[PDB]
Amino acid sequence: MASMTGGQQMGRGSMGAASAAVSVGGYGPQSSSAPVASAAASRLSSPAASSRVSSAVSSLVSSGPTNQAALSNTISSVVSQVSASNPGLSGCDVLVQALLEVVSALVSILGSSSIGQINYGASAQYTQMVGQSVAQALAG
Amino acid sequence: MASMTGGQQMGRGSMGAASAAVSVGGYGPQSSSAPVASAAASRLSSPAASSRVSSAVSSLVSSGPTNQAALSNTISSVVSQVSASNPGLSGCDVLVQALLEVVSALVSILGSSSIGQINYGASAQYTQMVGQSVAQALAG
């Protein structure tokens, strides 16, 4: 991929373009928040997260994989319990864990489910469904 | 103090926990549990987010709705561009927007796709797929 860097002021490259290094330091330069998502993935791999993923499967499957009401139920329940395990973590960390855990549950549905014709235009509508579940769930 | 009238107990030693309290300049005034997800949903409803959702559809559909490589591509690309629009937002806000936007894309796939037999046991495996895409994508 090779990320892009600014013409001047920091943003030094890496790998190659240097036969030998004659500088001493610790942590290299940064641009995007990587370790945040990395940490979320690590605790996402925890046994607690995996169990919640399974529960997300049963909820969506029984109520309706593509139902507004069913999706709202899954987001609300998962966010609550994920907070219960992680009181030490900041409020933002709670939101991260709930959201990506919902992503994993949906992946499980796709693998078990069959893919037909993609209704590309309505993709925005389903986006509204997810945004709706967040607002209603945390609104009250 | 839930020491009594409750089978579960707490004593980790995390200086207690915050729940329903009023203070100014000390314990971080103005909490943010609900409104965090609410704000993420609001900007998720932005035209920029909807367009990215559509792009997520094409990526997963063409490469493979249930492919490890395809999922990694979607997460990496979306996270990058979502940061590009939102430089003003904190690093955590960037992660939130990318993650739930992936959730919405998956919902679009489910609505267009057909549901067969749910392989409940492998749900944990698909959870590993998502965690993997995060680690690799931001690890560089």
**What count of other Cβ atoms lies within 10 Å of the Cβ of residue A24?**
5
CA distances from B12 to A39, B8, B9, B16 (A): 22, 13, 10, 9
CA atoms of A59 and A118, how far apart (whole Å): 24
Residue A48 to chain B, least CA–CA distance (Å): 11
Which of 76-95 (B) contact A at CB < 8 A? 76, 79-80, 83, 90-95
Distance, in Å, from the CA atom of B89 to the CA atom of B19, rounded to the nearest integer, reads 27
- On whether the CB atoms of residues B113 and A110 are closer than 8 A, the answer is yes
The tokens of B97 are what? 């927007």
Compute how many other C-beta atoms are within 10 angstroms of the C-beta atom of residue B26. 6
Per-domain residue ranges of chain A: 33-140
Give the gap in angstroms from C-alpha B105 to the nearest C-alpha of chain A: 7
Identify the residue whose tokens are 């959702």: B53
Cα separation of A73 and B1, whole Å? 30
Tell me the technique behind this structure: NMR
* CA pair distance B120, B139, nearest whole angstrom: 30
CATH class for the domain made up of B33-140:
mainly alpha
Nearest CB neighbour to B107, from listed A36, A49, A126:
A126
For residue B122, the one-letter residue type is A
- Residue among A3, A14, A85, A100 with most chain B CBs within 10 A, to mutate: A100
Binary contact (B107, A88; C-beta < 8 A): no
Q: Are A129 and A71 in contact (CB under 8 A)?
A: yes
Which residues, including other chains, have CB under 8 Å from residue B112's CB and lie 6 or more apart?
A115, A116, A117, A118, A119, A122
Q: Report CB contact under 8 Å: A123, B53.
A: yes
How many CA atoms lie less than 13 Å away from B20 in the CB half-sphere?
A: 0
- CA–CA distance, B52 with B97 (Å, rounded to integer): 11
CB B116 within 8 A of CB A30: no
Residues near A38 by beta carbon (within 8 Å), at least 6 away in sequence: B134, B135, B138, B139
CA distance B130 to B71: 7
Q: Which of A4, A72, A76, A104 to mutate to test the interface with B (most CBs of B within 10 A)?
A: A104
Which residue pairs from A44-50 have beta carbons closer than 8 angstroms and sit at least 24 positions apart in sequence? A44/A97, A44/A100, A44/A101, A44/A104, A44/B127, A44/B130, A44/B131, A44/B134, A45/B127, A45/B128, A45/B131, A48/A85, A49/A82, A49/A97, A49/A101, A49/A104, A49/B127, A50/B123, A50/B124, A50/B127
- Compute the radius of gyration of chain A from its Cα atoms: 20
Query: B17: nearest CA in chain A?
Result: A87
Report yes or no: B46 at the A interface, CB cutoff 8 Å.
no
- Interface contact B120-A57, CB threshold 8 A: yes
